[PDB]
Amino acid sequence: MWFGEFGGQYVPETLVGPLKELEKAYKRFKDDEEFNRQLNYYLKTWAGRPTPLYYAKRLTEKIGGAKIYLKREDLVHGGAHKTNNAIGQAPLAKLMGKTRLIAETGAGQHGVATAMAGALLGMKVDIYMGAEDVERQKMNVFRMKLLGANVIPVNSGSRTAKDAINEALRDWEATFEYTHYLIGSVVGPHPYPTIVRDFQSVIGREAKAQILEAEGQLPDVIVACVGGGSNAMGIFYPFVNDKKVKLVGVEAGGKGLESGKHSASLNAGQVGVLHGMLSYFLQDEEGQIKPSHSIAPGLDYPGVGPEHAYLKKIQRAEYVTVTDEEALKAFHELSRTEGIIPALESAHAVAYAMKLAKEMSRDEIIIVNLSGRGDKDLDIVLKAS
Amino acid sequence: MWFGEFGGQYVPETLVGPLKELEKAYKRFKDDEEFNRQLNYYLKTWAGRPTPLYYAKRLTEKIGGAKIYLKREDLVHGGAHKTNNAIGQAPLAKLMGKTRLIAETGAGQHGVATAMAGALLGMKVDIYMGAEDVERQKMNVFRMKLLGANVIPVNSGSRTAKDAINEALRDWEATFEYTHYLIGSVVGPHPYPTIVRDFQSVIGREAKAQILEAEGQLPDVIVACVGGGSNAMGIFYPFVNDKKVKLVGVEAGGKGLESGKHSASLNAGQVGVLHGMLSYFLQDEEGQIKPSHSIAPGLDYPGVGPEHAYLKKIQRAEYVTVTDEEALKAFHELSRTEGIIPALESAHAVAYAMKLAKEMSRDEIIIVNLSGRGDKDLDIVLKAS
């Protein structure tokens, strides 16, 4: 339910029953040998796991400090870690007797991921997306449609990722009998933050085995970008009890924390209740939710997962910010130095890892979670350059 | 050098030296321990090999005939099989003392793969691309630029892949002391058809191992699209001596064979000499090259590699055609039924496999080489609907 004080389940009474059925179903299937055999089979033959752990030799040399390794989630089918969670949840939903998946999306990768999983499993897919956001990203929208999903434009409120979630909740409240709400990050009411973290934990489990094989030791630091926080929790979680391993989450500093135009919920947000959870959210002078911004569409959500709020509070993980410009520089840097075009979200982690590596020893090890590939971001980087 | 009567080394005398040096270096490093360790290390950690062999269960049961397996080259770093060859040749060039790579490209995937390999290894990269091709695969043009490569639009002749190759050869003739011409298919003068096939053979060796795991037997049919023929040779080659395995190469039928707008070199072409090889080319009455067409840009090359000419001649492989319409239907069908968006090139193979599976028994097995992902073709598919 809770991670310290954070998380919980603060929802209308109509959602309590559906959320309890989800908890029970998850508890039933999470360690079920057949459910996991089937999931691992899809992850292997369909999604292409395991993804490699790549030693970025040129980048490491150029920075002259710590060894920089990249966990290559950019190679997962669909081009992002989102698939790990989509193909975890969709078969669970099907086993619960659901025939329909709904989901929120902003960067469109979770929409695509959900559309892919739904196509694969023969389930109807309706994707809620802000009416401003659908015009912002025509590529992923067309991908979703090609996959057989329906993209519902949201014309209410600020018409963005936050309001896509708002519409999805109303839909789910009416349709939960046959509809699974496939949430795309470690946010929302219990049990979603736990479920999504569990399905993303494969990243960390692979990375740990891979770094022990490659270097014979655990890393000194793990760096991952944090929007809602799923890719970060995915790679963090299996190292949480390894006291030696520093965990650093990188939020979108946007145009600078002083500008207001950013998405640094942990660094500059306030604790509060939204979308069924207690966590950090960006808030105005009055105390109401405030719009966020980032050059990276996937980091443009005003809140953050409760397990990160918890890790911040107990000082198990450190959270930092990287600006639009620094992410853009890192995007170009990785492309030119390693031949890997990263997602703009992932570029935030790379940007911070580059600063961090500089002040560390050559014997030390950083693993950066490369949460996705940058093919989706080409028009954005073109305009920005 | 020769595959029966096809192949050879038909170049100006000025290129005979560098080709002999390339053949010598390849001979030296081909079975060398360190070269192969590096290559396998790059293929694993950077490119993400092995790629999975996926059982398209829903597609299979929908057609109601033979089992359809997909070899998932769409998941290789870069989005296509081209990377296998780029990362094979680029380090060989470095070992030979070269500091610059040049390459041709039509669909842009080989250009991207060459730019990625060059970036990784810190080499300069110039890509020759036909002006027509620049305008219709512009996503890959920007990827190349972001990777630090220079894209040189080719305006000569019909402004297509054939013309790009013409300019590349002339460049290489002047710059061979420091430049390696990284050819992207099993075409060109010896030793390129052999080298590219060798670096793509990893596809078939993996597929062989994977189908024995999944089914306990070799497949009944292997199906692959054929432009120049590299992805086909890659998956074909390790099964050539397994007599029971049928090998089917699928060429672009375009708007129809009788319409004259296609790229079916093996099926409709005549014997000829171009780009340093004796093979089959689409040729008019007065010994000139007909302009090829396909909805799939990567199949838009008027010729075909000499090893395919040979395999057809000895009837070891069968070569068929699929129209634009049929490939497009397969693109949509795969996307909706399996949640995999294929390259339009690969959709030709899928299209033929679907027709073939219907005519075959449910106990029989078809492996289709899914040579690439379809993110590059989203605009082309929009127009062809």
Ligand SMILES: Cc1ncc(COP(=O)(O)O)c(/C=N/[C@H](C(=O)O)[C@@H](O)C(C)C)c1O
């Ligand atoms: C490549 C990539 N990297 C990082 C993120 C940030 O999500 P987290 O991993 O959950 O912090 C994302 C998030 N993308 C979502 C989407 O595709 O809609 C995001 O916009 C929504 C969860 C709000 C991403 O696509």
Ligand SMILES: Cc1ncc(COP(=O)(O)O)c(/C=N/[C@H](C(=O)O)[C@@H](O)C(C)C)c1O
């Ligand atoms: C995804 C994909 N699938 C199939 C092909 C056909 O090339 P082969 O494998 O050499 O027959 C291609 C060929 N692409 C080349 C390129 O990307 O430049 C082609 O346009 C040129 C080598 C002519 C491809 O990109």
Ligand code: NA
């Ligand atoms: Na946030």
Ligand code: NA
């Ligand atoms: Na051809």
